Nucleic acid binder design. Structure first.
Ligand SMILES: NC[C@@H]1O[C@H](O[C@H]2[C@@H](O)[C@H](O[C@@H]3[C@@H](O)[C@H](N)C[C@H](N)[C@H]3O[C@H]3O[C@H](CO)[C@@H](O)[C@H](O)[C@H]3N)O[C@@H]2CO)[C@H](N)[C@@H](O)[C@@H]1O
Ligand SMILES: [K+]
Ligand SMILES: [K+]
Ligand SMILES: [K+]
Ligand SMILES: [K+]
Ligand SMILES: [K+]
Ligand SMILES: [K+]
Ligand SMILES: [K+]
Ligand SMILES: [K+]
Ligand SMILES: [K+]
Ligand SMILES: [K+]
Ligand SMILES: [K+]
Ligand SMILES: [K+]
Ligand SMILES: [K+]
Ligand SMILES: [K+]
Ligand SMILES: [K+]
Ligand SMILES: [K+]
Ligand SMILES: [K+]
Ligand SMILES: [Mg+2]
Ligand SMILES: [Mg+2]
Ligand SMILES: [Mg+2]
Ligand SMILES: [Mg+2]
Ligand SMILES: [Mg+2]
Ligand SMILES: [Mg+2]
Ligand SMILES: [Mg+2]
Ligand SMILES: [Mg+2]
Ligand SMILES: [Mg+2]
Ligand SMILES: [Mg+2]
Ligand SMILES: [Mg+2]
Ligand SMILES: [Mg+2]
Ligand SMILES: [Mg+2]
Ligand SMILES: [Mg+2]
Ligand SMILES: [Mg+2]
Ligand SMILES: [Mg+2]
Ligand SMILES: [Mg+2]
Ligand SMILES: [Mg+2]
Ligand SMILES: [Mg+2]
Ligand SMILES: [Mg+2]
Ligand SMILES: [Mg+2]
Ligand SMILES: [Mg+2]
Ligand SMILES: [Mg+2]
Ligand SMILES: [Mg+2]
Ligand SMILES: [Mg+2]
Ligand SMILES: [Mg+2]
Ligand SMILES: [Mg+2]
Ligand SMILES: [Mg+2]
Ligand SMILES: [Mg+2]
Ligand SMILES: [Mg+2]
Ligand SMILES: [Mg+2]
Ligand SMILES: [Mg+2]
Ligand SMILES: [Mg+2]
Ligand SMILES: [Mg+2]
Ligand SMILES: [Mg+2]
Ligand SMILES: [Mg+2]
Ligand SMILES: [Mg+2]
Ligand SMILES: [Mg+2]
Ligand SMILES: [Mg+2]
Ligand SMILES: [Mg+2]
Ligand SMILES: [Mg+2]
Ligand SMILES: [Mg+2]
Ligand SMILES: [Mg+2]
Ligand SMILES: [Mg+2]
Ligand SMILES: [Mg+2]
Ligand SMILES: [Mg+2]
Ligand SMILES: [Mg+2]
Ligand SMILES: [Mg+2]
Ligand SMILES: [Mg+2]
Ligand SMILES: [Mg+2]
Ligand SMILES: [Mg+2]
Ligand SMILES: [Mg+2]
Ligand SMILES: [Mg+2]
Ligand SMILES: [Mg+2]
Ligand SMILES: [Mg+2]
Ligand SMILES: [Mg+2]
Ligand SMILES: [Mg+2]
Ligand SMILES: [Mg+2]
Ligand SMILES: [Mg+2]
Ligand SMILES: [Mg+2]
Ligand SMILES: [Mg+2]
Ligand SMILES: [Mg+2]
Ligand SMILES: [Mg+2]
Ligand SMILES: [Mg+2]
Ligand SMILES: [Mg+2]
Ligand SMILES: [Mg+2]
Ligand SMILES: [Mg+2]
Ligand SMILES: [Mg+2]
Ligand SMILES: [Mg+2]
Ligand SMILES: [Mg+2]
Ligand SMILES: [Mg+2]
Ligand SMILES: [Mg+2]
Ligand SMILES: [Mg+2]
Ligand SMILES: [Mg+2]
Ligand SMILES: [Mg+2]
Ligand SMILES: [Mg+2]
Ligand SMILES: [Mg+2]
Ligand SMILES: [Mg+2]
Ligand SMILES: [Mg+2]
Ligand SMILES: [Mg+2]
Ligand SMILES: [Mg+2]
Ligand SMILES: [Mg+2]
Ligand code: NA
Ligand code: NA
Ligand code: NA
Ligand code: NA
Ligand code: NA
Ligand code: NA
Ligand code: NA
Ligand code: NA
Ligand code: NA
Ligand code: NA
Ligand code: NA
Ligand code: NA
Ligand code: NA
Lengths: 144, 214
RNA sequence: CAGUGAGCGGCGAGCGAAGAGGGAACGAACUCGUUGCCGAAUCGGGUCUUACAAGGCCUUGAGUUGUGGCACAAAUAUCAUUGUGUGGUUGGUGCAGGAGUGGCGAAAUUCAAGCGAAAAGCAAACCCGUUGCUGAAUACAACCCUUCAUGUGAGUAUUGAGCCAAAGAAGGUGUUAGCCCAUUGAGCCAUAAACCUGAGCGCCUCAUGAACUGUAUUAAGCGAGUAGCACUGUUUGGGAAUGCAGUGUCAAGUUGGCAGGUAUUUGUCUGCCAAAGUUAAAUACAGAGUAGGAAGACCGAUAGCGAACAAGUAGCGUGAGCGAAAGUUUGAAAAGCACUUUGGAAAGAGAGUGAAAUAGAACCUGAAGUCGUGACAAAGACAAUGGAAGUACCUCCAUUUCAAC
RNA sequence: UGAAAUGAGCGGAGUAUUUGAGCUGCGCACGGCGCGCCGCACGCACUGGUUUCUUCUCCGUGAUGCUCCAUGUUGGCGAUGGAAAUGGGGUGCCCCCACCCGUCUUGAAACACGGACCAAGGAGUCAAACAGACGCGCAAGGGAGGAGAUAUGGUUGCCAGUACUUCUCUCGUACUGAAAGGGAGAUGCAAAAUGCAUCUGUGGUGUGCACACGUCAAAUCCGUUUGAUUUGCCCAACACC
RNA sequence: UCGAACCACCUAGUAGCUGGUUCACAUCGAAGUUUCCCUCAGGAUAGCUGGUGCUAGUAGAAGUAUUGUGCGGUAAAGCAA
RNA sequence: UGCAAGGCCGGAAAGAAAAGAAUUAGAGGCACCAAGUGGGCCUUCUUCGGUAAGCGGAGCAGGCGAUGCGGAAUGAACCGC
RNA sequence: UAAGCCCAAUUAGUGAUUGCCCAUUAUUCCUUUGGUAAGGGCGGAAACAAAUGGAGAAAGUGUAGCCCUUCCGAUGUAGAUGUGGCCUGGAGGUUAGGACGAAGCUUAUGGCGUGAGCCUAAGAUGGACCGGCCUCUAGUGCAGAUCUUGGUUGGCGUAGCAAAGAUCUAACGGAGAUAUACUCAACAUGCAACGUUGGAUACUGGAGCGGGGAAGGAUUUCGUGCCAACGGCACUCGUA
RNA sequence: GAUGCAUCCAAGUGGUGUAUAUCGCAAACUGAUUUCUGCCCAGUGCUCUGAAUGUCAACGUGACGAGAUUCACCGACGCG
RNA sequence: UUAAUGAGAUUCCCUCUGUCCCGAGUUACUAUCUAGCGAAACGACAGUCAAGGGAACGGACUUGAAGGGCUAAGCGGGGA
RNA sequence: CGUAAAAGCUUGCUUGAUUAACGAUUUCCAGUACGAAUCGAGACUGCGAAAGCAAGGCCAGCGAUCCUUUGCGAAGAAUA
RNA sequence: CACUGACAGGGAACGUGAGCUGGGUUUAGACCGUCGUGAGACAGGUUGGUUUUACCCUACUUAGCUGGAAAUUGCGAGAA
RNA sequence: AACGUGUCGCGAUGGAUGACUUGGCUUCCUAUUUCGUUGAAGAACGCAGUAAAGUGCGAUAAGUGGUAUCAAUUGCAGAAUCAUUC
């Protein structure tokens, strides 16, 4: 709202907080990001290192759908299991089946301690995740 | 001063703003509620005009492409002639009874065709075909009682007769088998990935070794 | 998707898309050339049929340097023969209903109280109240006191009593109106054609589908100075070149061609089949029009369009062009000041109208600044103004007090 | 003007009380002489003694009042008047103060610039990207958007609103490498080129709110509460690994 | 109107430069210096300042002394070193 | 058994005596978001160039700028405050 | 015989160690305001009608601040921030006013607030709308930009209205006169300026203030009427 | 000496000097007459009916290679 | 170099004169006064000086010296 | 400035003027780069009988992005 | 050069341009020399080249009217 | 004295302010909605009893015809009918 702005407070202050000496001129520094290497170099270097230059190979016509690969860790697997299935899930017995790609995940990573053992249908899995889930009593089944 | 801020890339350097000297280049949505009401009003009017035919013609079920969406299902453009022939419908006649026909879509798997054939079979069983002459009914055409009893689908996707798109059922809970207990999933997956990834270099190395033998 | 861990860029400033996904729309598809089989079966022009008929008859007029028919993946002959049908988009002919358009069409007080002062109030949630109580306006009118005068426009206000509401809708009417007017609803009436309705319903005519059985089939082709390629130029995020243009050069189709975002020669794979054409909706209307509607947390006559008004006008410029100011807003009604008197006239002084004339005429309200006038305050020359303290005089200001207070 | 008069001052009670000054006892300090002798202005302890002079001495009222306001005497003026007072307003005059505003500038009263009067108008706005502070919702999840659906397939209008829906999209829960591609718990036992076992758990150490054991000091209206501190756990944080 | 006419439009062209910039009180309160810049009438950047706070309110306090322990080559003095 | 280092378990602590033997209007640290300024000028002492200058240029610190008031008759910088 | 210069005193060889005058400084008292503020009270103690002790007491950033006690700071350009801080147009709510007078306008109309401002009074002003409070919102506050538009204004009855020589007279016409309280014969109290006709004087001097045309203008031509405005004085005249 | 020189012009079977034809047309300089107009081609220009000449582009010709690519040769005004 | 020519630049001489010594008198039209008519420029506020300081050249300030008020015609010292 | 059985001179042997896992730090300073420095750790060496001493000539002698260009990723081994 | 008693030096915004004059200096035209490839340059020479406004306030010069000792009032009383 | 100054009351000049709003601006929607050689858009000249502009119209000229409406228009004037249509 306009009534909350400094302009209302500055009615009658003449210079409106811009000073008598410097004044509020049009473009005292140049427009946009001008002078990135001249007269603004310190600002660019200390706050945005890496801004200038080239790095790495080019990938023409990037398509993100082929590269789709969201990940979920072992300690987050309870988010994809219903509460009733998690309660009845015990090591060495009937276990819930988690379908990662229908849940929006492609790879099982395996950080932390798995809370509820389960069977996980995943496209990819890290070696540590596969080891830990089998030790905990679960299993990983590859899917596509 | 400037301080620690993000480097701006606002992309507003063209004559987009209407002013005294520029016609501008802008699009507003102030008519959005009115166009929504008009579109619904047109749909209701269209339903009345084509009564009792369903507002939306029957469409097949297809699998979304790409590895990101291959698990999803949605409606496609039209039924392929192969699906229509399997369902017992001539494609040119099918287009006259509210069935969309797409002669471009291939049928690369039995499961993809079978679901659409079942859709056509369900629609054909529910279809009530009005006679061209209610005095001399021909085979397949409906009786007078069914004609008066006819109602209009009007659903958004035109799927009242056949149902929504069918997704595979979730797997029921089960125990872990002995093979899943002892088998190294990562090693199997990594070996298969390495077979494709290093296919060219492995084949060249084998060929160079064979040339070394000879 | 995406201001993008794409890309383009003195890789600086900056620039910058595409596929997928959720959706809108969608009865969405068709025509030619070519190929094969037919070969004037075609088109104009006369003439007749209720008819410039998608019809018959005729016609060298056009046309064989090829009009037209049948089949080509939504496909699996055509071509008779008989029966069953269909076409309102074949042309005549004539019969309905509807929509649309226009016209017409609703309720209830001008109820009671009359005037400067009760056509006003009080009884402190609610109720008692359908009741009780009543008056600080014996008013005011300009220094005070007499005497004689003069003054209250129209009730959409107030109070009391009611009434209509499927209508409370917001405009008008002399003050603020559901009941004064108009309006606000069902509904009624009348229609060139076109539009919509068992592709509305008949007749003539003209076309035409499927099922009958007999009937001759597999063979061929599918767009060339075009696509590519070289140079140049331009364009693009498109980068050993995204699209295009000029010239040069110019294919393939018996290892066919194009696309698959790092150039080359290869070998696979995937999608598609360029160089002919038509096509409704979803979209635009960023200084347009025609016929109507809805409006607005917008502006309120130096604002809002330049223009609320005889405004693209008056006026200006040789011309291209430039381009204002200005609300007639007196009053409820012209009742727009008769008549007398002075004046050449304009007008003045009287008198009238009106609630108001200081509402008197492009007239509501009538500010600031400036000026005239009467009364008063004073004041040497310190330019004036200003500050702080008193005092002199004034004061239609405020407040307090007036009896042992 | 006594609406809580804390008074050496007010109210009661009694001729006493102990301050100092003089005069002096013992011891010790102190000073002069070279071992204990002399002196001692009068210092310290006995709160020594003498009271010769000089003093007054003791006791006493909580708020059952949370806050504000309200209580004399003598005259003058004021007895309802066009009155008397006090304050305000106006004009003039005295004595003393007092350079013209705005602006740029080290510096303006300036021989620096804009400055005859008045009216009306006249200048940090809207949009997008990001960030921080603060408010609100939800939370390992948050939220759309577009579009549908029907209350509304209704109504001049109110209704361009409100109500409802989304296997989607987006920002996050994971980060790294130019890329190909990989991808993070603890403890125990043990050292296997993916070691085994367990799953109620801050990876460790140092400093660190509250809380829990006690422990001292101050003050209590004796109920406690104001600090400090030992130990334990240490939250958030910070620093070494 | 001429060392580049006139008219309309792009055009509210851009200006580190000049001028302007509309109510009150209250709590605080500067800098003209550092570094980089075709930089020198301008900017970035530290410093100064305000606001928001966070943390266990004397914890890692000091434009000052004292003591201890280091550092120095100016004022003086010297040329008889 | 020495040395270097990181810890553990105990002990002792005028919490810092005495000798002139500190003082404090001493809540220490930690962030976050930003403004104006980046022309200065004057003075006591030090000080460079210049015959010198109300000249130019530095050091330490005060002051004006941004600030009136009381004084030096008058004066941005002097005295007092 | 300083009211000059140097030194030294504070009423003077007497008996003791503050002569006097001026600050926005110091001390102290009252009031305001803000704190890195410090504390206390907030479970209504009891009792109490009028005629004839009272009132309040809110668990609170900020208000007319819940009340009371206490301590400290208070200036300031550029600049920052805060304000139950002020003001304007419009919207959502709520509560009111107005024909017994709304808005607007006027003021030696006072009162309140440190202030922005608010409120009352009077109008011998006006004639139909409009106030307060909470929230929302914006084209929201002017003294000055050689600022924009409109109006006014001192200069000022001032500079001036001076090339082209020059007009005089009578009569008539015209409201434009010969226009008079008393006194008084007329002068000393109606001035000035006109159109026409007749006279007089002069000018243009045929390269003409002569008579006709083009360009340009377009009724200015002619007659009658008419003097408001216009012909920079005047008009009874006129291309008005 | 027209199959031209100068030159307009976005462009054409376009335009001007040119309805012309060296006693003409176009481009410079000097500035009546009189009397004269010296030396310098090194420089910078302009120009030449001078080379079996160095260098300069594209086009062409040949070659290595799977090919892109690359290499060799040829190559005019101009400059030397 | 140059006769003739020139609103071209220069020097001297004769003639001539108010150019001057050195000013005076006269005329028309103004100014001046009146009747009618009637502006602009400009305008912070204003308007007596001396010295002093001061942004180093004051109408405002310090200290002194002047200053009764209002007018007509001139005038060009100041109003940087 | 420092240095005397050297840091100077002579000479004998040498290539510590190489490499150096992004270790830390000084100077400039914003506590950023750049250039010069300091203290290391690892490899391979030189000299010396040995402790040791050297990754240049102590401290001045130098250079971003983009682009160009060069070096390194030897051979063979791995059923992945 | 001449006279004279003498022909002294200075200040007053290097007194004095709304007082004049405009010769010089300092625009645009043009010539010369030197300089420059050139456009052009030269405290070098040359020639030609618009000098605006007062009616305001003070100051000065003259010219008129007219109050006033509590320097307008007090009645506030002072005689050279 | 006079000019001049200040205040108050009343007038003049001057048209701000308020109230008013058949205008503008802006946002939506509806559709057998898109001119012209069958002479358009634009320009010119005319037309009323009275008529400059403007508006309407075109020598049939502030209009003819038809349908609906149902007693006017209006400054003045004129006008058969005072009305199922004529
Ligand atoms: N009286 C001194 C002046 O009064 C002026 O204001 C005065 C006027 O504006 C104002 O208006 C008055 C009014 O009061 C009085 N009661 C009625 C009078 N009609 C009004 O006067 C007004 O109307 C008349 C004509 O009717 C006009 O002539 C007059 O110019 C106009 N001001 O009365 C005010 C007097 O109090 C100015 N505010 C100011 O310059 C100054 O103080
Ligand atoms: K400055
Ligand atoms: K800063
Ligand atoms: K798929
Ligand atoms: K009404
Ligand atoms: K306080
Ligand atoms: K509060
Ligand atoms: K101002
Ligand atoms: K005037
Ligand atoms: K004539
Ligand atoms: K006139
Ligand atoms: K010659
Ligand atoms: K001649
Ligand atoms: K003075
Ligand atoms: K580049
Ligand atoms: K001069
Ligand atoms: K020239
Ligand atoms: K001349
Ligand atoms: Mg300020
Ligand atoms: Mg600011
Ligand atoms: Mg700035
Ligand atoms: Mg600056
Ligand atoms: Mg690279
Ligand atoms: Mg049918
Ligand atoms: Mg994103
Ligand atoms: Mg672009
Ligand atoms: Mg697409
Ligand atoms: Mg054909
Ligand atoms: Mg009645
Ligand atoms: Mg009176
Ligand atoms: Mg083809
Ligand atoms: Mg081609
Ligand atoms: Mg097309
Ligand atoms: Mg609406
Ligand atoms: Mg107006
Ligand atoms: Mg307008
Ligand atoms: Mg306008
Ligand atoms: Mg009136
Ligand atoms: Mg008097
Ligand atoms: Mg006074
Ligand atoms: Mg006593
Ligand atoms: Mg009292
Ligand atoms: Mg200066
Ligand atoms: Mg400054
Ligand atoms: Mg100033
Ligand atoms: Mg000066
Ligand atoms: Mg200045
Ligand atoms: Mg200036
Ligand atoms: Mg930031
Ligand atoms: Mg993250
Ligand atoms: Mg602008
Ligand atoms: Mg600059
Ligand atoms: Mg400024
Ligand atoms: Mg302060
Ligand atoms: Mg400046
Ligand atoms: Mg010395
Ligand atoms: Mg010495
Ligand atoms: Mg010596
Ligand atoms: Mg000690
Ligand atoms: Mg002083
Ligand atoms: Mg004495
Ligand atoms: Mg302050
Ligand atoms: Mg507004
Ligand atoms: Mg007044
Ligand atoms: Mg504004
Ligand atoms: Mg104003
Ligand atoms: Mg005159
Ligand atoms: Mg004259
Ligand atoms: Mg004359
Ligand atoms: Mg003249
Ligand atoms: Mg007479
Ligand atoms: Mg006369
Ligand atoms: Mg003559
Ligand atoms: Mg003539
Ligand atoms: Mg005439
Ligand atoms: Mg005249
Ligand atoms: Mg020549
Ligand atoms: Mg010659
Ligand atoms: Mg000449
Ligand atoms: Mg001036
Ligand atoms: Mg002076
Ligand atoms: Mg002055
Ligand atoms: Mg002067
Ligand atoms: Mg040695
Ligand atoms: Mg490092
Ligand atoms: Mg070196
Ligand atoms: Mg060196
Ligand atoms: Mg070195
Ligand atoms: Mg001098
Ligand atoms: Mg001079
Ligand atoms: Mg001059
Ligand atoms: Mg002068
Ligand atoms: Mg001259
Ligand atoms: Mg000259
Ligand atoms: Mg010169
Ligand atoms: Mg007197
Ligand atoms: Mg007297
Ligand atoms: Mg007309
Ligand atoms: Mg005709
Ligand atoms: Mg009729
Ligand atoms: Na800065
Ligand atoms: Na309704
Ligand atoms: Na006025
Ligand atoms: Na007056
Ligand atoms: Na001084
Ligand atoms: Na004070
Ligand atoms: Na205080
Ligand atoms: Na010649
Ligand atoms: Na030569
Ligand atoms: Na030559
Ligand atoms: Na001076
Ligand atoms: Na080493
Ligand atoms: Na380099």
């Amino acid at each position: 709202p306009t009534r909350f702005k400094k302009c209302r407070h500055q009615r009658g202050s003449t210079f409106c907080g811009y000073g008598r000496v410097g004044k509020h001129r049009k473009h005292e520094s140049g427009r946009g990001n001008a002078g990135g290497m001249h007269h603004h170099r310190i600002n660019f270097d200390k706050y945005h290192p890496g801004y200038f230059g080239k790095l790495g190979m080019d990938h023409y016509h990037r398509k993100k759908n082929p590269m789709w690969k969201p990940t979920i860790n072992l300690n987050n697997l309870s988010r994809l299991i219903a509460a009733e299935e998690a309660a009845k899930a015990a090591k060495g017995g009937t276990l819930p089946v988690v379908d990662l790609q229908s849940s929006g995940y492609a790879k099982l990573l395996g950080n932390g301690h798995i809370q509820v053992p389960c069977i996980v249908k995943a496209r990819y899995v890290s070696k540590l995740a596969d080891k830990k889930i089998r030790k905990a009593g679960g299993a990983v089944v590859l899917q596509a | 001063p400037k301080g620690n801020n993000a480097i701006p890339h606002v992309h507003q350097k063209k004559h987009w703003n209407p002013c005294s000297s520029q016609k501008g280049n802008v699009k507003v949505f102030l008519n959005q509620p009115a166009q929504k009401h008009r579109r619904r009003r047109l749909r209701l009017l269209k339903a009345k005009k084509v009564f009792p035919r369903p507002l939306k013609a029957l469409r097949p079920q297809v699998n979304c492409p790409t590895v990101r969406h291959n698990m999803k299902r949605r409606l496609g453009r039209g039924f392929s002639p192969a699906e229509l022939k399997a369902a017992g419908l001539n494609p040119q006649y099918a287009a006259t009874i509210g069935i969309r026909v797409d002669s471009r879509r291939k049928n690369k798997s039995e499961e993809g065709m079978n679901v659409n054939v079942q859709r056509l079979k369900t629609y054909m069983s529910k279809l009530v075909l009005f006679p061209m002459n209610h005095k001399k009914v021909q085979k397949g055409e409906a009786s007078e009682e069914e004609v008066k009893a006819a109602t209009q689908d009007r659903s958004r996707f035109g799927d009242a007769a056949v149902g929504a798109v069918v997704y595979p059922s979730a797997e029921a809970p089960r125990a872990v088998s002995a093979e899943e207990k002892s088998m190294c999933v990562y090693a199997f997956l990594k070996k298969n990935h390495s077979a494709v990834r290093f296919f060219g270099t492995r084949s060249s190395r084998a060929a160079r070794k064979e040339a070394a033998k000879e």
